[PDB]
Amino acid sequence: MKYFLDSAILEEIRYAYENWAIDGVTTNPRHIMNSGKPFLTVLDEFASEFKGVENFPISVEINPHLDNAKDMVEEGTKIAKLSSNFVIKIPCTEPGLIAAKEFEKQGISTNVTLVFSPSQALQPARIGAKFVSPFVGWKENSGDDTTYIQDIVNIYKNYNYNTEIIVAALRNGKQIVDAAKAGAHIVTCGFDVYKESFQHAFTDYGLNKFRNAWDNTV
Amino acid sequence: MKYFLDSAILEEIRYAYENWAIDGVTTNPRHIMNSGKPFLTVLDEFASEFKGVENFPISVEINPHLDNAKDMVEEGTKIAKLSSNFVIKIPCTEPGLIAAKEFEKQGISTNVTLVFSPSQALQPARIGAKFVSPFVGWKENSGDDTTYIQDIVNIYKNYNYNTEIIVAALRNGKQIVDAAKAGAHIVTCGFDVYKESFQHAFTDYGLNKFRNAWDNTV
Amino acid sequence: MKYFLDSAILEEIRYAYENWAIDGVTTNPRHIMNSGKPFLTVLDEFASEFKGVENFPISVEINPHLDNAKDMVEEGTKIAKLSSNFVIKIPCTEPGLIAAKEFEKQGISTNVTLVFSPSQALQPARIGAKFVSPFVGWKENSGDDTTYIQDIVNIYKNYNYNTEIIVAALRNGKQIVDAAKAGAHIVTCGFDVYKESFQHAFTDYGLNKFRNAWDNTV
Amino acid sequence: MKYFLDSAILEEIRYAYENWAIDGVTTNPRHIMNSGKPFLTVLDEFASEFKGVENFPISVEINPHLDNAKDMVEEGTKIAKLSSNFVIKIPCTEPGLIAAKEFEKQGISTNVTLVFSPSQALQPARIGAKFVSPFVGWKENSGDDTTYIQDIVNIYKNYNYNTEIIVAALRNGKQIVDAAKAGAHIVTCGFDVYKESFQHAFTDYGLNKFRNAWDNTV
Amino acid sequence: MKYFLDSAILEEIRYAYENWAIDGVTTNPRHIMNSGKPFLTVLDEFASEFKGVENFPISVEINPHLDNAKDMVEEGTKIAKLSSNFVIKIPCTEPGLIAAKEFEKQGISTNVTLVFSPSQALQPARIGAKFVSPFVGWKENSGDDTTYIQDIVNIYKNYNYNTEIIVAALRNGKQIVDAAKAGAHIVTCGFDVYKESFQHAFTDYGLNKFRNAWDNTV
Amino acid sequence: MKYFLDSAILEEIRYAYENWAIDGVTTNPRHIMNSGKPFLTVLDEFASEFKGVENFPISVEINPHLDNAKDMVEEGTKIAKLSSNFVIKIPCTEPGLIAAKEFEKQGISTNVTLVFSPSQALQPARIGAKFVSPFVGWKENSGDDTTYIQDIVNIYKNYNYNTEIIVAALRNGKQIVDAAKAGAHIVTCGFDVYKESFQHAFTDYGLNKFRNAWDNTV
Amino acid sequence: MKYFLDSAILEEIRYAYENWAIDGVTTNPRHIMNSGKPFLTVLDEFASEFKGVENFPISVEINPHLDNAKDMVEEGTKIAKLSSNFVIKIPCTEPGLIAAKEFEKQGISTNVTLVFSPSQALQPARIGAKFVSPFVGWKENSGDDTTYIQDIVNIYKNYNYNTEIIVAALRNGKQIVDAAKAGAHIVTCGFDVYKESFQHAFTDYGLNKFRNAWDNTV
Amino acid sequence: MKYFLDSAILEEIRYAYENWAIDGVTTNPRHIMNSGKPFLTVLDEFASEFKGVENFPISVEINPHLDNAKDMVEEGTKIAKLSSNFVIKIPCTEPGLIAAKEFEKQGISTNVTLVFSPSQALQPARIGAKFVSPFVGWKENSGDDTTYIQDIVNIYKNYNYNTEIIVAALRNGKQIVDAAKAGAHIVTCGFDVYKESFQHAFTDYGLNKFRNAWDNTV
Amino acid sequence: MKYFLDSAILEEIRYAYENWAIDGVTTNPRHIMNSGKPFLTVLDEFASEFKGVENFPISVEINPHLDNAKDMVEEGTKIAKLSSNFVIKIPCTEPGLIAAKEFEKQGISTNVTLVFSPSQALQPARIGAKFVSPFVGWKENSGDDTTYIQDIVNIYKNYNYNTEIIVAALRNGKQIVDAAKAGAHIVTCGFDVYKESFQHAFTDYGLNKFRNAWDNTV
């Protein structure tokens, strides 16, 4: 399973890469907004930080106001020319799946994002998208279940698709264990979701019992 | 999974082929009727539109009044001589499965249509039909379930049959996700069923949140 | 099970009431639009057609542009004063569930519509809404499953709620059989969905066999 | 469970009533055809045979060529006036469910027959039909499963319907055990299906072992 | 659950009644054969042993060569006149279910035996048999499973039948636990099957551990 | 899946071979009886009809009165010398499984028939029988289920047995779909069971809709 | 659910009764051995400690060497005369179930212990034992599962038995949660099994987070 | 599946080897006791009967009183030197699994018997025992289920163990079908369990129908 | 399956290695405390006892008070230099998974212990830990289930991880059978848990029956 840091903060991207062995980084217009830095700045920093690093995908969403596939291809071609690690993130919309097919034909890796059904996930796979990001957290906040994730994993496998599934909007380590149990390729999560997922109360209860024993021993 | 456009309109066949990457086109006497054009005209246009295109099957149903396998073989041989992309569609009837066996022996690809049970689907497979079209929508309109589709997929697989299953009469993207979850080879659907299957409300709710963030960012 | 005609056409409402024993009528801004008649006209006709008829609920949606619960209560109080059979249909929105609670406190029957999750269905029940309309067809068109309907039925039953569930956006008789198998109180469907649900090919195949026998008999 | 003899032969109806305790008799235009006697004759014999017998329903199908509910009501009123044991059998068709509602309103018991889906079974229940006959054998002969029978039983029970389900077209005692396991009220079967259902090879193997023991005993 | 001793030996019937609280006794032509005593003798002893005992059913099979219901009714009426505890055991055969219906109409308790299917068990219930004995051991010896027992229990319960099910041919206490888990009313077993069913190795292993402790204690 | 015609009539064997592509023919003493022709005559006709045809097994049962394995081997050796397509059918009896082992050792193909349990099916496999015929229809007529067929298929597969399973006594196309869903190698059925299995009412309802469209089209 | 302390130490019986609200106390020859006190002494202390306490059962096992039901009845009558809270514990053995039936007939409450199967549990219920103790821990130590406990609970319930089930040999709180999920009446456990069952690491992790907050608050 | 005759009688071992193709023979101190012949005699006969026969394992249990692994190795080495077909049967006890490890290291095939849990079966596999005999009948006689057999088969398979599982204490052909459905390698049964497993009542009912037809045929 | 002795006592490690074929030894600060010997002494003895033994992993936990990954790497490098059989055991904590990644990069085998969730188990696998020890007993003592073990096994397998799972805190042989049924690589248990797992009461009951037979035999 790959662990992609869903963050636009380079202090958290640097830490997770050196200590948690993250395999990539995903960003959205909301994360770059919370960065405080301007978009092009965040990109320049990400391009230099991982200049040589190979096999480190950095998903970067194009202008969300774009409505024409041709305007999404001109904007994503420019962003993709800034670093070989950059993967253009395109919304699962009529003009975003037409633009993702043209991009993939020109050899520009694309991450069809905002997919909330297995029918919206199959077309990105039929056009050779490098990544497809099915969202979980958003649907749950509205009281909807998310075992459409297993369907996408099973469909992708049954039809031998190379598109890698990035379960997104993950909020806890139990949802990371649900994606892993399904067979999802990658899971994108914030720095704190990953930190807490590596911590249990019984590990602290157990370490106190072992610390008491060590002390009562020569 | 293959996406065959269930349409006889060449404006929708041209669009779906260039933007959605459809893998084929299926037609029935009802779709050619709604075309407005005469049958032979629709065929001439389809033959020229995809003259060179290879691996683009165009299922064309013969006279539905035909009742003798010999009259169905003389009519389907003529239609098949109009284009190498044409696949003769024959009803699953005593004289339609005798005519589909003779056709397949002469090397004319056949699509045994109007199959509504796994027992009606097995004979088309025992005679080497190129395609078998199990219908879903019709049975549902009368209050009948359609998990006989999984049976056909499982039987075809267990006995290593080459016949490709084309789930037909699909009306929504959830039925396209049911066919994909079963392992069906192809799904034939109208242009609008495919368009809506690529669209979700949460993609629009998500694009508004990302459009607000992009705006509140330098 | 109750059969509510999802139509604003009084030729279809009159027929279904006299021949199919419909138990009510649901309408939305889209059905009144397709009526061709102006809204207030459709209402006057519905009010006179069922002037005396008791226990015949006629769900009528208020202005969809309304955004304040107070503006939705002033508009729905006026519509409700036009007939005792009228049930104000309100969208499941913050200001639509505040307006549905005030309406129900004043004794005006309300039908909280556009519910697409069991969490959105529970609040309408916690405020004493007369009806809650969970939509099926829309979610399916986008490739989403709808067994959240059983959850709502089970929750409503477990907590002894009086709110009656009206499964909406039904498109076939198999979806009417799914709602009945779940235990939904009412199912709202168009005139043609109900007509086809009462017809099977095997009834026609069987009637031909019985018509041949009757003829070969004195 | 009730055992209704699906026969128009009075030698088999007389035997089954005196030895098997049949609870009723169902007939169709095909069984009266195989009787050899003319229809009105079969009816006169059935009317006299069970003149006084109470609680012995005798389902009799009206002219299968009838297409108007008014012509089906004039024909079934005449047949019903021939004996108080006669139950008018009407096909599940638009004009047959309109005629079954008028009949039930006039107090004439009706058996809505040729039902092959749970959606076609629910309307007969919504109009107060005395009996609804879901067919099994016919659908199976075409390779279709029949666990729509459990759905009808469950729906009827969930909504407290009084209509009694008569599983029809039964061909073996295992299908009688399937109907009983579902909770069907009545099962209609031919004389030979009932005879064989009461016989097992292990009963004969066991009776030979007990006959040998009896002989080797004083 | 009732425990009926499947034996014709009065040393085992006397012991099981005073120590195991057996609720009845079932016999077959094979058990009376192994008794060594002549049939009428075994009956006289059983009649005197339980002369006053009430609610102690003693199932006694009539001549297994009998083939006419009238000859089975004359033979079973004589046997039934020998003791009020005697229950005539009749094979599940055409002439044995006709004879069991006449017997039950005259108030003579009957135990329709040699039933090996749930279809053969339903008719005995439709005629008011006091007991129905579904056999298990015989079918298993030939490699057949026996979860038709649960079907009979469920059918009997669903249709509120008073007939009590006596699971017969039981050979081990696990088959007694299978009948109890199903809900069977009575289980008939040989003396040794009951003795071993009350004994476990872990009870002896446990009693040795408790005997060692008792000894190492004042 | 192989389709073996369970018939001794050469008009039906000739038709099914030329139009349905039957893969073999099974016969029993009852089918040769209904042929009207004497046994040796039926055999001579079958031997000439398929003189050269290879891979066309013709199962022929030996004298059913035979009780010694040596008398069954002398009778089946003679029948097998009449044609290379003939497969000696032997009953699953002590002397029939001893005779089937000797036959298979001499290279005479055998079809161990009348198998009604998975324990009776395993021995035929342990002796290298070419075919094992588990019967379904007979057990069902007595109210018994038949999912012992899946057990035999699973056992045969788990232990890599070459014996081919011929599900016999099939009466409908749903039982042919049950055998195919299990993984049975061959299914033997009468000519009419195969004809009806290839026909559905919805194919006729669909062909009428397509015939109306063709007519309303130039 | 009742919580019976499986202990013969009165410091732990006194604590659990005043702080955990134990509903009873079970003892075995092994627990009295580990008490250090002589048996009769432990009994005198238990008799005085709960002299007046009503509804506080104190299970006390008789001499484990006893082999005759008459010697077990003379020993258990004496022990039962020492306190009205004492319940004679008898092993599930031929002579222990004969002695438990005589005891229950004289009105002396009995706890048939060392039961390791649902067949050994049913007889104690057929003789009116006050308690039946199915052991879990012992069987598990040898690698055996224990979902025979649910069978006993279900059987007891299906046949309306008053005998109360005391799941014994419990070693952890997950086994206490398994007995409660099954529906067992009582669970007997050692003092430490109960203490740890009331403690979780996440309660300590949570109390540290709440202790930090309380401190950073006025 | 292998069929090992659980017998010490050479008339039954000779018959089963020549007619049923048994693949081996298992014996226990109880079967040699019932032989009537002295142990060493039974061994001499078995050694000569199968002197040359290869791949015919003959399991022979050593002195059951042995308590030291060294005394079990000296006794089993002597027995193993009497024939190359002999496989030393050792009980699953601390000193029997230490002796089975030493035996297997010296190349003496061992059959660790009296295994009644999957935990007792895993150690025999961890030491390279040639055979492990999990007992079924004994546990069932005490009311215990035996689906620990599937666990052993699954564990053995998951960890690629070569030890062959011999399901023992089998009493009917349904238990032979349970072992085969699990995937057990061998099943050991008495001569009569195997004979009855090859016989069904429906084979005799079917042979009577075929004998009547043969007679009514020229 | 590997059997690792969870003990720091060399009398039990020596016995289990020579008689039970243990494949390794795991220790924790609590086991070294109960050893009585000082830590460095236990290590020197373990280093000499298995000086040459290859493939015998000896898991040794570092100072439990360590809180910095750099202090855990300096302490575990020293311990690892004492023997090539030693595997540094590190707690699943932020600084323990950073230290386990550095250790594994330097070629020092690590056993990430105190893992109580499948999310805490995945990171140890993403950093190439040699072993991951998921604890069972502790969670159960607090009333928590442990089928997160199957999740870890399935995740490890789905993503082809080489990390070997050591199910720890095992207290009975049924928990050893649960780990084996899941597919866990190793199970660590105390000497007594392993001894009892190899013993069953039915083996002693069976050995008494075989000892009685041997005696009644020449």
Side-chain angles (χ1 to χ4, degrees), chain F residues 95-101 103-104 107-144 146 148-171:
Chain F
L97 262 164
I98 291 152
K101 194 169 94 305
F103 265 129
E104 279 296 339
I108 297 190
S109 303
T110 65
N111 168 223
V112 173
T113 198
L114 294 164
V115 169
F116 300 81
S117 76
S119 93
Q120 254 200 141
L122 236 172
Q123 182 63 49
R126 289 168 80 288
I127 68 165
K130 155 101 224 159
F131 293 121
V132 75
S133 285
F135 285 28
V136 148
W138 292 12
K139 305 181 73 210
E140 312 243 299
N141 303 338
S142 42
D144 332 332
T146 59
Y148 87 104
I149 300 305
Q150 182 63 94
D151 304 349
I152 299 163
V153 174
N154 296 338
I155 289 155
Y156 273 36
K157 257 87 148 150
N158 176 77
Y159 298 102
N160 332 295
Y161 279 122
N162 299 334
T163 305
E164 278 210 289
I165 296 150
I166 316 196
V167 181
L170 275 106
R171 325 291 211 195

Side-chain angles (χ1 to χ4, degrees), chain G residues 5-9 12-13 25-28 31-32 35 42 46:
Chain G
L5 187 58
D6 196 7
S7 171
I9 282 39
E12 293 182 354
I13 291 149
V25 162
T26 85
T27 74
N28 59 31
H31 291 124
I32 307 288
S35 89
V42 175
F46 286 6

Side-chain angles (χ1 to χ4, degrees), chain I residues 172-176 178-180 182-191:
Chain I
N172 43 259
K174 145 274 189 329
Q175 265 168 322
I176 305 173
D178 300 335
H185 306 58
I186 309 113
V187 274
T188 218
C189 319
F191 193 92

Side-chain angles (χ1 to χ4, degrees), chain A residues 3 15 19-21 23 173 180 183-184 195 197-198 200 202-203 205-207 210-211 213-215 217, chain I residues 29 33 39 61 63-65 91-94 98 101 114 116 119-120 122-123 126 138 142 144 151 158-159 161:
Chain A
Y3 272 6
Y15 184 95
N19 308 294
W20 300 348
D23 320 85
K195 214 158 180 117
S197 90
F198 311 153
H200 204 141
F202 253 121
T203 292
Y205 145 98
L207 272 156
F210 289 177
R211 270 179 298 151
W214 186 273
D215 300 344
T217 298
Chain I
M33 171 200 49
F39 188 27
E61 188 121 53
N63 168 245
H65 300 262
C92 192
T93 60
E94 248 282 37
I98 291 152
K101 194 169 94 305
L114 294 164
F116 300 81
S119 93
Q120 254 200 141
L122 236 172
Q123 182 63 49
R126 289 168 80 288
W138 292 12
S142 42
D144 332 332
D151 304 349
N158 176 77
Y159 298 102
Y161 279 122

Side-chain angles (χ1 to χ4, degrees), chain B residues 100-101 103-104 107-125:
Chain B
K101 194 169 95 305
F103 265 129
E104 279 296 339
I108 297 190
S109 303
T110 65
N111 168 223
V112 173
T113 198
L114 294 164
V115 169
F116 300 81
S117 76
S119 93
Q120 254 200 141
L122 236 172
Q123 182 63 49

Side-chain angles (χ1 to χ4, degrees), chain F residues 165-176 178-180 182-185:
Chain F
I165 296 150
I166 316 196
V167 181
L170 275 106
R171 325 291 211 195
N172 43 259
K174 145 274 189 329
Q175 265 168 322
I176 305 173
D178 300 335
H185 306 58

Side-chain angles (χ1 to χ4, degrees), chain F residues 7-9 12-17 19-36 38-43 46-50 52-53 56-66 69 72-73 76-77 79-80 82-101 103-104 107-144 146 148-176 178-180 182-195 197-208 210-213:
Chain F
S7 171
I9 282 40
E12 293 182 354
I13 291 148
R14 273 214 241 57
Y15 184 95
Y17 181 65
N19 308 294
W20 300 348
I22 52 160
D23 320 85
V25 162
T26 85
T27 74
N28 59 31
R30 176 260 293 176
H31 291 124
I32 307 288
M33 171 200 49
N34 297 310
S35 89
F39 188 27
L40 280 216
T41 278
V42 175
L43 294 199
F46 286 7
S48 54
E49 170 62 8
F50 295 95
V53 184
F56 195 80
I58 296 154
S59 297
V60 176
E61 188 121 53
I62 71 193
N63 168 245
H65 300 262
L66 253 29
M72 283 176 238
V73 164
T77 282
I79 302 147
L82 307 177
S83 134
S84 65
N85 291 262
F86 285 167
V87 172
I88 303 308
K89 175 182 267 171
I90 315 154
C92 192
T93 60
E94 248 282 37
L97 262 164
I98 291 152
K101 194 169 94 305
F103 265 129
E104 279 296 339
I108 297 190
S109 303
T110 65
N111 168 223
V112 173
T113 198
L114 294 164
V115 169
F116 300 81
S117 76
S119 93
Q120 254 200 141
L122 236 172
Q123 182 63 49
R126 289 168 80 288
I127 68 165
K130 155 101 224 159
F131 293 121
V132 75
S133 285
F135 285 28
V136 148
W138 292 12
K139 305 181 73 210
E140 312 243 299
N141 303 338
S142 42
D144 332 332
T146 59
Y148 87 104
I149 300 305
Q150 182 63 94
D151 304 349
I152 299 163
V153 174
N154 296 338
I155 289 155
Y156 273 36
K157 257 87 148 150
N158 176 77
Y159 298 102
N160 332 295
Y161 279 122
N162 299 334
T163 305
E164 278 210 289
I165 296 150
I166 316 196
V167 181
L170 275 106
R171 325 291 211 195
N172 43 259
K174 145 274 189 329
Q175 265 168 322
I176 305 173
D178 300 335
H185 306 58
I186 309 113
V187 274
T188 218
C189 319
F191 193 92
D192 284 349
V193 170
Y194 279 129
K195 214 158 180 117
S197 91
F198 311 153
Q199 262 122 92
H200 204 141
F202 253 121
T203 292
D204 318 325
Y205 145 98
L207 272 156
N208 161 244
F210 289 177
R211 270 179 298 151
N212 300 319

Side-chain angles (χ1 to χ4, degrees), chain B residues 160-176:
Chain B
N160 332 295
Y161 279 122
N162 299 334
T163 305
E164 278 210 289
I165 296 150
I166 316 196
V167 181
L170 274 106
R171 325 291 211 195
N172 43 259
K174 145 274 189 329
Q175 265 168 321
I176 305 173

